[PDB]
Structure 1
Amino acid sequence: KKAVIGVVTISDRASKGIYEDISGKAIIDYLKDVIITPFEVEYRVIPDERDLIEKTLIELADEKGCSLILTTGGTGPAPRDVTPEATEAVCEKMLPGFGELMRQVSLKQVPTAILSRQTAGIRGSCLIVNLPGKPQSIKVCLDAVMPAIPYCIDLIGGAYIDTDPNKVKAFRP
């Protein structure tokens, strides 16, 4: 399968052209920097409407054939932050270890790391992971979870991905 990665930015201010999406860009830069195998990116910037979040994740995995989807934004305690809810709504199997580890590494930086509801799950042969907002916080989580992503994708029948062992080691037991 051709490796396709989705990057979804859930932001009203970004979807309005009001501001630059430093979050999504950070994710795309990260992927380009560490991956050494051929892949394409399906980038989407949408408003924080659970309706549109669920449909976007479904289109990317079902129609665009993404084997991995990385979201950014809408994962805090505020009532409008429904990215986790939308992810649960489209996945058939969740992965608690992802949220646990991401909050773990984020705690070293800020105590409010515990307010994050970021999670991850599976839909068919696609893995969906909720990332943080700040470009430097996204790097921290990615460095922590990327090591297990390519292998997870292998286990769910997704496309082959491999990374620069000098930037991030894709662990494969």
Structure 2
Amino acid sequence: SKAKIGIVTVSDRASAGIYEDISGKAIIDTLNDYLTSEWEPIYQVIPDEQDVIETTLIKMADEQDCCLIVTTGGTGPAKRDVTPEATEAVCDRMMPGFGELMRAESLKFVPTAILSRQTAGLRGDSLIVNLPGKPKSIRECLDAVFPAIPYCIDLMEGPYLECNEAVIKPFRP
């Protein structure tokens, strides 16, 4: 089948209106650079509301057959930040290695990396990954974890993602 990839920008400010969604743009730019195979971006901007996040992810995974869903925003210690809660609530099983690696990688830049509650889990055969907010952090997190994603999707019997190996090298054992 053809790959559907969800992109969820979680932000009160973006939902109120911003000049440009630089976080969401950073994701689609990076994914376009990664992928040679055809794919369909399923994009949504939503507020920091746990229930709305959950609803969004559920539709993308269940109805829209998204094999991957990447979120940006709402992963810090602030009370409004509930993307990880929403993610835990919708996944059947978590992927501890992703949160581990993303923080380890982010800590190479900033001591405050350990304040991120970014996680990842599976809802059926969809992989959902929580990314940071800043465009450069987004690319740093994706460069770190995406090498494992096409294989993860393979094991989940999902679409076979083909990458521009001039940009990123998926590992497939």
Do they fold alike, i.e. is TM over 0.5?
Answer: yes
Map of 1:23-172 to 2, 5 A cutoff?
Answer: 23-172=23-172
1:15 correspondence with 2:15: yes
Q: TM-score, normalised by structure 1?
A: 0.98
Q: Secondary structure at the match of 2:141?
A: helix
Q: Secondary structure at the match of 2:88?
A: helix
Q: Quote the sequence identity (%).
A: 71
Query: Is residue 147–residue 169 contact of structure 1 (8 Å, CA) maintained in 2?
Result: yes
How far apart, CA to CA, are the structure 2 residues paired with 1:78 and 1:2? Answer: 38
Residue by residue over 1:112-146, the C-alpha shift from the partner in whole angstroms, topping out at 9 and shown as x without a partner, is: 00000001000111100000000000000100000
Gaps of 5+ in 1: none
Alignment size in residue pairs: 173
Runs of 4+ in 1 over 6 A off after TM superposition: none
Shift of 1:157: 2.1
How far apart, CA to CA, are the structure 1 residues paired with 2:50 and 2:158? Answer: 26
Shift of 1:19: 4.0
- The letter of the residue matching 1:165 is E
How far apart, CA to CA, are the structure 1 residues paired with 2:82 and 2:11? Answer: 11
Gaps of 5+ in 2: none
How far apart, CA to CA, are the structure 1 residues paired with 2:163 and 2:98? Answer: 19
How far apart, CA to CA, are the structure 2 residues paired with 1:14 and 1:169? Answer: 32
- Structure-2 residue corresponding to 1:2: 2
Shift of 1:34: 1.1
- The letter of the residue matching 1:95 is M
